[PDB]
Amino acid sequence: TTIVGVKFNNGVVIAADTRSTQGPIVADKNCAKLHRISPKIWCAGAGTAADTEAVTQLIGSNIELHSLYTSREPRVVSALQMLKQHLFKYQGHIGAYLIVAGVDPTGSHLFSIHAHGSTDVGYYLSLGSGSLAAMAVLESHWKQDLTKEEAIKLASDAIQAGIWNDLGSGSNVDVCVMEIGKDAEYLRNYLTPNVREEKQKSYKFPRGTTAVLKESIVNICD
Amino acid sequence: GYDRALSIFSPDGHIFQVEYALEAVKRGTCAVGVKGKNCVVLGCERRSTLKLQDTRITPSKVSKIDSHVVLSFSGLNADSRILIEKARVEAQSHRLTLEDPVTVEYLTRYVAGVQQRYTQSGGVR
Amino acid sequence: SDPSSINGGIVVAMTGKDCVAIACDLRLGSQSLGVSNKFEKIFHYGHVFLGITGLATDVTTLNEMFRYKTNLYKLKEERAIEPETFTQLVSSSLYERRFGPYFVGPVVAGINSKSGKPFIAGFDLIGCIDEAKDFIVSGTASDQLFGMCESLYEPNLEPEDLFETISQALLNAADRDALSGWGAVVYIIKKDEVVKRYLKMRQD
Amino acid sequence: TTTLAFRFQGGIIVAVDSRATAGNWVASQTVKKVIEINPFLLGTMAGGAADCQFWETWLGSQCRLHELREKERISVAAASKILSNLVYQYKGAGLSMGTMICGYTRKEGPTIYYVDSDGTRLKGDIFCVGSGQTFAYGVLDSNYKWDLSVEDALYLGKRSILAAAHRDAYSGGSVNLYHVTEDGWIYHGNHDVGELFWKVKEEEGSFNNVIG
Amino acid sequence: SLGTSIMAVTFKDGVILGADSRTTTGAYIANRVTDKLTRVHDKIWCCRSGSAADTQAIADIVQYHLELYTSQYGTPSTETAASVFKELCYENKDNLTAGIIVAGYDDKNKGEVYTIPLGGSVHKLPYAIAGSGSTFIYGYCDKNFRENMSKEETVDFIKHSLSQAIKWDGSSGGVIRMVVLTAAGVERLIFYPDEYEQL
Amino acid sequence: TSIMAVTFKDGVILGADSRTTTGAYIANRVTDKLTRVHDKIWCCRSGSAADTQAIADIVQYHLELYTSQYGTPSTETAASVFKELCYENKDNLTAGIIVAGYDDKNKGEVYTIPLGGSVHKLPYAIAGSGSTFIYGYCDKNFRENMSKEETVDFIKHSLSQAIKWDGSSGGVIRMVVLTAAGVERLIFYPDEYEQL
Amino acid sequence: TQQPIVTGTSVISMKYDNGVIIAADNLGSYGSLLRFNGVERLIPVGDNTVVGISGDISDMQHIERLLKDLVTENAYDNPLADAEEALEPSYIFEYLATVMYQRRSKMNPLWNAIIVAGVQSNGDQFLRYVNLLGVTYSSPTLATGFGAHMANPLLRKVVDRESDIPKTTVQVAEEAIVNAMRVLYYRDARSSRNFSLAIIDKNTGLTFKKNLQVENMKWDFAKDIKGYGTQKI
Amino acid sequence: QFNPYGDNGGTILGIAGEDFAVLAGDTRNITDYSINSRYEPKVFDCGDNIVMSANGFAADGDALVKRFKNSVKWYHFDHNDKKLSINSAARNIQHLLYGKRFFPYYVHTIIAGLDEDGKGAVYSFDPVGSYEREQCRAGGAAASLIMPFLDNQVNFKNQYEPGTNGKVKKPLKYLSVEEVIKLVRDSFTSATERHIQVGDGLEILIVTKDGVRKEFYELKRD
Amino acid sequence: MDIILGIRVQDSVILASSKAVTRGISVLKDSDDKTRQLSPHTLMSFAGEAGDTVQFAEYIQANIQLYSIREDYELSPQAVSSFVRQELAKSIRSRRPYQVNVLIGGYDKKKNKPELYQIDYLGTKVELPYGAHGYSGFYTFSLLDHHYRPDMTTEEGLDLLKLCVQELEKRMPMDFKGVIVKIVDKDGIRQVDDFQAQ
Amino acid sequence: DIILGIRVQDSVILASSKAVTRGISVLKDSDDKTRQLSPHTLMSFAGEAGDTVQFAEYIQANIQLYSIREDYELSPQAVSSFVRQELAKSIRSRRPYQVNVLIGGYDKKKNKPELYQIDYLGTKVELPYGAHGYSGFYTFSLLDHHYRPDMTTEEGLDLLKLCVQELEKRMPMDFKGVIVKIVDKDGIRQVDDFQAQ
């Protein structure tokens, strides 16, 4: 997959492709790699999809429960610590490489997490199959004090690098903008440059084409 | 190493060495073979000179290649031995890869083939 | 041997107008050797349908499990479980064995009784969900089924068309897989009724 | 694969399947597993398609040179032995083959020689080779008879490759069937197993447990 | 993992920690601006090398210990802090890849430096060097380290020793960070490439 | 081992330690790692002594003949023959040779031949297990066109540190100075170099 | 069967309206040790071809010696060695590709990824890749090892397809390359700041640049980065 | 250790018309998750009205093609400019492949052209030279995704006459170059979607009694 | 492995089960009965790993006998298999897996039908007309598929087995010392003691 | 596969299994694992697939060559000396022939029967009775007991049959019985009736 996070002057924005592979075969041509942990703490994940979804969701719960217990808006450093201490506790056997981001009472925040439990802090980040293609764009384009609009571009252009140049990534782009003032806006399929061209033929069949041996009504209601 | 052309064409179209080889045959002890209706016989002159031979062991002119084929000859004795040995081997080999003994022609074609080879190869007479 | 390739078989599921279809072959192998032409891989818990490919013992065990779970669900909640909710149960149940997973490739199909909208979903052995809107494949002939489903499918088919499609999709794929075949069954699922049809194919 | 070859009053019968697999993925179902060595000799394919196809074609070349030289058809024994001695020369080199070299000559009648890459060479009356061989051997053994009519025997053969195709995942597409006579082999066509299957169940009553 | 180029040097007024900025995974530089200087307590810091996952998880757990200790026995010695690191590194030799340098400032002891290599052993020292890039500056450091240095001198000594490690070690690179620890609080420095390369 | 070759204003100096170990056992503690292949072309060798000695033995032969028919060989031609052996036999050699020689035209030249069989021509070259510790020091301290006595001290101090850290290095510090004047051999014992 | 020792990281290149560009850092790494700093990995041959070489340096040095011998050998009994019978990229590339595949086929490969870049006599841009395995391929952009993953993504944003070649100017192209070199320098632990760059133009001829450096880097932001998550100072 | 084989993954297809034949192949050549070219022809005209593709490990395929073409050149030089029978061509390739039986050319190869009656022909081969005449055959990375479709849409397999009960197979009616090219594009566009090594482009070489002609169609570039 | 065969005819279920037990090089016993009676109208043939094989069968039998007495009732030949499968399912992700294969031949007195179930060591249950474990099916199934008829008389069943056993004796290398045959019907379980030269 | 041999008063008896098993299928229940080297010398053999016959036939051919060249029959002793000598070469060969043989012969000069056992390493030893592989393990116990050097051919055939019953009873492989051959002063002939005795 291909994920990134980009800080901007009043918040943080993250994006991701939508290709889901298994071996060389594309299983899902449009899945979201973007995962809500709390309303303002979204998480982009690469690696084993069951592990990214599960560990994201598990912490999300514990954060919600905790947020209710404390009567305070959850923090991105809270989700960060809970994730690393879990992943690390597993020595890597949970295939989740995450880019956690959000806004909370202390500000906007952007971190990366690795399967083994390590964390990094940065202004621009990327993970996965496409990482390098994306990071090449990021290195070439990021500048300090980007506008929200500028970062939405930079972010999205970095995912594209991944879509095209990387075979582990493709289809469309998802984005989520966490602004400090406002609600988190989750722009799903914010870009869909890969649309299948109309086929060269309907393959609909004449009815009766298939040889049937026996038919029956199955019962559902009791 | 040594490959000089010993068997070659002389101006009138003859290969002198081969002819001179036949001359050796001309001086060989008369060998003869005639075919019957259901048999074949081979006769062989042996010089009358020495009443002092040991006839049990002195190599005999008729030789078996296999259990069903024999070879008689005339010319240089020592050369014959070399043709026989090569023949008996080809016989045992033909059985080993065809599971059936050689036809008299096949064996012959083989031996004659070897003879031919010494007329057209370097370093050999 | 890879346990997901021992027994063999496939499952496929699609969506058309106000309906969903779900098919499977009938083979049960012990690798090379054909063992049973009557191993259906499609089960139902109320109006929600589950197809499971992979290791035979695990398929049987999972059906037994989801029957058990969905029964206790119906008693507590006083209503049949829906596809959206079940797909979650499936996922949670599988991930609960993250480190000794059932070697399976399940598929969910059905119509939500309130929303009335058609729904399908698939997942790897560890419950990572794929909720594609068009179709879902699984089995020793996944490769082949993607090939068929991608060329043959078109949105909003009417049941008897969807039938013809998912049948032709399954059939030709099962026929390029050594470990599938030996019969096939197709369910056409709708708001009111469900129709199970058996197909006539090669047996080799 | 399933390949078989038996000997009877009529001569020899050879029957095989068509399937070729690469993992579980079926690659082809139109493979000639009977090799037309020459007008009077057939060989079967099992092990390495290339190994068999390539070396048995080279066997026809070798048989041709024999006849061109000895002015007389090669014996089934001599043709088989030739392939066998070649193969042995490559023992433990990677080669893979299980084949039946079949012929009908005057001197030796109908003859079948089994030859594998291990070097092994065996003369016999009935052989089966491939993953599906145990299925074929079941039909044959119980029903084999030297007094079979060419018509019954072909059926018997085609029937055995059917039994095998059915169970064996790695067997079946169609059955290529041959009848080997002294004047030569005669090709008795191709019989798609999908179609043949049902026909036979309806006629024979067999495959009772299969629905349809 | 941090692979790394790190050092801690005691001088007249206290001690300075220094480190490169690069963390690699293979040949790709995962993060070129890593803060390898980690704070376990106001004036007791460490520099990390070997598995990030591990070194972090450790620094984190030591901090926690030093925080609870602080709450009930007042402030801890750089020694007490080093001890806690080692107890973790030694008691888990089988599952850790961490080489940590511990540096701190007591008013009584001024600068102190404890190195904790792979085994889990402890060695108190005037200065210490560690990480992938330290093999290349053993020669240089030892020849130029001098005890009771000026702060200005100690910063030069680190800036030079590290510039060399960065030069030769591919696993080390980036900016050069330093943390200063004296009675006058905690100072944080940084030197960019355009500067340290030119030495 | 710790070995190096430094060029200066008058020519070039090679230096080595004297320790050859097999495991943690010091087999010989007075090894002469300064190996001459021609009057004024010498080499420092590291890796299997067997292989380096067999290569030096051969190179020596190659230059001896060269000299008999084409006169004095260049310091480059020497290194060429070394690479030719090391590179074309990379699969069975564990030799890391440094070549150094005084020429009259170019004065001192230094060519290092690492494991690859690749050749690199440098102002100075350090190699051998101990060299890794002195990369730092030597880079900060080396200067083009030093004097002799300065260059001797550079080596002595550098190999002094190498020895101090590398267990596989030690013994005495040998030097061989190559200039017009001729070849002058040097030796420095521990008590002397150990405390600098 | 072998294994590389002293090695050279990435080699990058693209084509533009008239000719082609190619670049390569001057570093000979020995594992993690950035051992040799003055290594030229661009090898010009004739006034119309430059050969970029990553991978093993000893095996690179062997190819250098091989390439000069093609010149000197093509020059033999050839009165037109500086004209119609000059070595050409097409030719140089076929010679190497040959050697390379014969070596892998002998299980003794020349441990490199090579990029042949230049201009044909009729002005056409030549740019093709070969590696230790004898694999060969062509494209508007070509890079080895790391540069494949980082340079191409950026260079393909400039010449995404065949129809962008006439539209790219030497100044736009060269800018793109120099940008990519800095990216590899930011993110390729085996990279050097110094590099050589080369231009083969049908009009301007062969232009070779040594001793370049990565300038205009962005490191200022590093000071705001502190800790690894929860640390504030 | 040095591993001499590689995998540039591509996907080819050959279809034999009644009086024509097509050999198609994607354009994209690769290495792991990275793209080497979006345009690297893999189907080549080799003379005497024959087309060839040697898909798998590019270095081996090109080396195999180079030899076969040179083989063709020399057939003329040795047999008085005689044309190479598609069938003779096939036998000649078996020998080239089998020649390397113990260090195999790691490529699944396909040739296409016309038989000796102007009838359309396609031959298919192993990596070590086992060959068969074929009606239609796909090769490479995406072949699993193409052949089951082609059984259905060319030999109308599993299809019966509507309302017949499934008692009569659909008629085997025969297709044209324009109807075929439709199927090829559909196959490839379909495969492009579900295989990460298939994309960029499609180049089809078509052989008829009038010679060799070719068509190109783009493919999604993700 | 040893020969485990099963065949469900009209009125009954016949189970064949080889008599040879081999340990390495010598054939230790030429008269073994690889079967356990679980319940009056339910028999279980078994084959696999040494020791596990019996431990399992005796263990199953015990639980059925215990069930039978607790509810003074005989479990359905289906129920019994569903239980037996569950026990093999557990064994699979177990510390040390039982490696035992089985056939359940029963006569369901309620439905007045004979039933045959084959369950491998993995807990892979399938209910058949004729079943077999291991390589046994490789020789025999070609024959059963051809000649088997759901309406066969028990004697037709025994004849079909005889033909199956012969092929096993002809083409199979291991000499399994003949088979023990038993019939499970509405009247109970009994052993055909005359399967020698029938 | 079973290779047995026993030397009695005026003959040598060889027993050799008729089964040929490849895979899980017994391809043949009729194979005669022997070759007649010479009119009064017979050789049974057992071992690796092709090698087994390729070796047997090679020897035979060679002995047939020696016979013709000299118009004489080599003693059974000389033949076994030659045979060992070949197998001895095989062991340090690139690829060894893995064949075990038995050589039963009647020495026409000395008028005694002789039985030689040679394993693939070229280990020749001359015995009253012998076997290769595990055949020794089940039979030897009985041969040690009953064997008499003065036995008649009939007495030999009985002790042999008894050894065959032991193998049949306690050996886990069905070898489809043996083919018995007798070498005596009148040459070699086959006991075509050993199914019942």
Side-chain angles (χ1 to χ4, degrees), chain A residues 215-220, chain C residues 187-188 192-197:
Chain A
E215 176 165 313
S216 55
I217 286 70
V218 176
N219 189 19
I220 302 307
Chain C
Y187 290 80
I188 281 295
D192 34 303
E193 59 153 21
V194 164
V195 181
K196 182 166 80 157
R197 303 181 193 165

Side-chain angles (χ1 to χ4, degrees), chain I residues 17-55:
Chain I
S17 313
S18 41
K19 299 193 275 79
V21 175
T22 310
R23 286 293 177 281
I25 168 177
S26 280
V27 181
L28 295 187
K29 196 163 184 292
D30 69 24
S31 70
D32 203 57
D33 189 1
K34 282 140 201 140
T35 211
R36 274 315 112 112
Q37 189 211 128
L38 310 187
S39 139
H41 303 117
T42 299
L43 184 68
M44 182 177 65
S45 64
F46 52 79
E49 166 57 357
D52 294 5
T53 218
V54 166
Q55 285 294 157

Side-chain angles (χ1 to χ4, degrees), chain D residues 53-190:
Chain D
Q53 180 175 109
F54 180 89
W55 284 113
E56 287 179 6
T57 292
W58 165 91
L59 176 66
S61 273
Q62 302 310 309
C63 293
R64 180 72 188 113
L65 275 307
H66 176 94
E67 302 179 5
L68 264 172
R69 195 144 42 197
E70 310 307 315
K71 305 129 85 89
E72 183 179 19
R73 274 180 69 182
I74 192 167
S75 48
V76 188
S80 74
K81 192 105 165 190
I82 283 174
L83 178 65
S84 180
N85 289 183
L86 181 290
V87 149
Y88 183 70
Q89 283 265 101
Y90 284 100
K91 193 171 178 171
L95 280 177
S96 178
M97 38 169 285
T99 195
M100 277 71 82
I101 302 306
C102 315
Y104 194 148
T105 64
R106 278 298 291 273
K107 306 74 166 181
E108 43 181 355
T111 319
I112 301 179
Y113 275 103
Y114 165 83
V115 182
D116 69 20
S117 65
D118 281 19
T120 302
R121 164 167 173 268
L122 283 172
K123 198 165 81 168
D125 318 85
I126 308 164
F127 289 110
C128 298
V129 188
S131 53
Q133 70 188 29
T134 50
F135 302 102
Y137 276 120
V139 174
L140 272 44
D141 290 332
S142 61
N143 299 71
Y144 171 77
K145 190 137 288 143
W146 178 270
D147 288 316
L148 224 48
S149 68
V150 164
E151 194 200 31
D152 285 320
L154 291 156
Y155 186 76
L156 180 57
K158 187 207 298 161
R159 180 60 178 83
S160 305
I161 299 310
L162 173 61
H166 183 51
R167 293 294 198 157
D168 197 41
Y170 300 106
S171 292
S174 35
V175 190
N176 296 129
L177 218 191
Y178 288 73
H179 170 221
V180 176
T181 68
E182 188 174 327
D183 291 329
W185 51 264
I186 307 166
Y187 175 43
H188 285 240
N190 152 278

Side-chain angles (χ1 to χ4, degrees), chain B residues 40-72:
Chain B
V40 181
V41 180
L42 291 164
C44 302
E45 173 190 310
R46 281 207 297 96
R47 316 147 236 263
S48 288
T49 327
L50 271 35
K51 324 307 163 194
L52 209 46
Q53 286 280 66
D54 180 327
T55 48
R56 303 177 297 166
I57 73 194
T58 310
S60 182
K61 273 69 193 295
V62 174
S63 302
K64 303 206 299 168
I65 306 310
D66 213 330
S67 65
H68 72 282
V69 203
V70 291
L71 175 156
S72 176

Side-chain angles (χ1 to χ4, degrees), chain E residues 27 29 35 60 168 170 177 188, chain G residues 32 34 187 189 222 227-228 231 233:
Chain E
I29 295 165
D35 191 13
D60 293 3
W168 300 116
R177 297 183 186 284
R188 218 182 207 325
Chain G
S32 324
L34 310 167
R187 290 327 225 277
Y228 45 80
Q231 176 163 317
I233 69 178

Side-chain angles (χ1 to χ4, degrees), chain H residues 20-189:
Chain H
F20 64 101
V22 296
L23 205 192
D26 58 3
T27 287
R28 170 178 292 177
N29 174 292
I30 90 277
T31 314
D32 298 322
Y33 292 102
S34 198
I35 283 180
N36 298 311
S37 181
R38 301 179 176 287
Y39 190 76
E40 189 66 17
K42 189 186 311 192
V43 189
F44 304 102
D45 177 5
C46 303
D48 301 11
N49 211 224
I50 309 174
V51 288
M52 178 175 184
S53 172
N55 175 241
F57 161 62
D60 272 351
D62 293 348
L64 179 66
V65 164
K66 166 165 292 202
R67 278 164 53 74
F68 172 70
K69 288 178 179 175
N70 200 221
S71 182
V72 177
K73 176 165 194 173
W74 282 90
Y75 179 82
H76 304 324
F77 287 47
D78 299 343
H79 307 91
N80 200 309
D81 280 288
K82 177 170 193 183
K83 190 193 179 61
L84 199 68
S85 332
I86 192 73
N87 53 277
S88 291
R91 185 63 71 80
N92 174 227
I93 294 169
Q94 156 160 100
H95 280 67
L96 293 176
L97 284 167
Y98 208 89
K100 293 211 76 206
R101 170 64 175 78
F102 300 116
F103 192 164
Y105 281 105
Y106 201 84
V107 310
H108 166 24
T109 148
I110 295 178
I111 70 175
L114 293 177
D115 74 22
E116 304 204 48
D117 306 341
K119 259 281 215 307
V122 181
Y123 284 94
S124 181
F125 300 83
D126 261 348
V128 308
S130 177
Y131 79 104
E132 219 63 51
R133 179 158 185 173
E134 231 100 61
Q135 55 207 330
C136 95
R137 147 133 296 157
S144 344
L145 296 80
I146 300 183
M147 295 295 279
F149 174 60
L150 271 39
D151 302 320
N152 189 232
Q153 295 292 340
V154 171
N155 318 53
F156 313 106
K157 294 230 167 78
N158 291 120
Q159 309 201 238
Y160 297 91
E161 288 290 57
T164 324
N165 177 212
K167 288 289 158 181
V168 66
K169 305 201 309 295
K170 171 173 175 178
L172 259 155
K173 168 74 181 199
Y174 225 55
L175 321 195
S176 59
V177 51
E178 295 84 8
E179 184 56 44
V180 164
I181 295 170
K182 287 188 186 188
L183 287 171
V184 167
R185 289 174 67 161
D186 273 358
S187 292
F188 277 91
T189 30

Side-chain angles (χ1 to χ4, degrees), chain I residues 22 24-30 135 138-139 169-177, chain J residues 21 23-29 134 137-138 168-176:
Chain I
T22 310
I25 168 177
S26 280
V27 181
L28 295 187
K29 196 163 184 292
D30 69 24
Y135 288 112
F138 282 80
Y139 306 97
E169 281 167 6
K170 195 195 218 317
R171 299 290 176 183
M172 217 204 87
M174 167 198 305
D175 168 17
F176 54 92
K177 266 45 179 160
Chain J
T21 295
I24 64 180
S25 284
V26 181
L27 288 197
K28 202 172 193 201
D29 83 339
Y134 298 122
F137 287 86
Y138 311 96
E168 232 146 39
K169 177 184 180 57
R170 296 292 182 174
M171 210 192 86
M173 284 303 92
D174 180 341
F175 56 86
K176 306 308 192 174

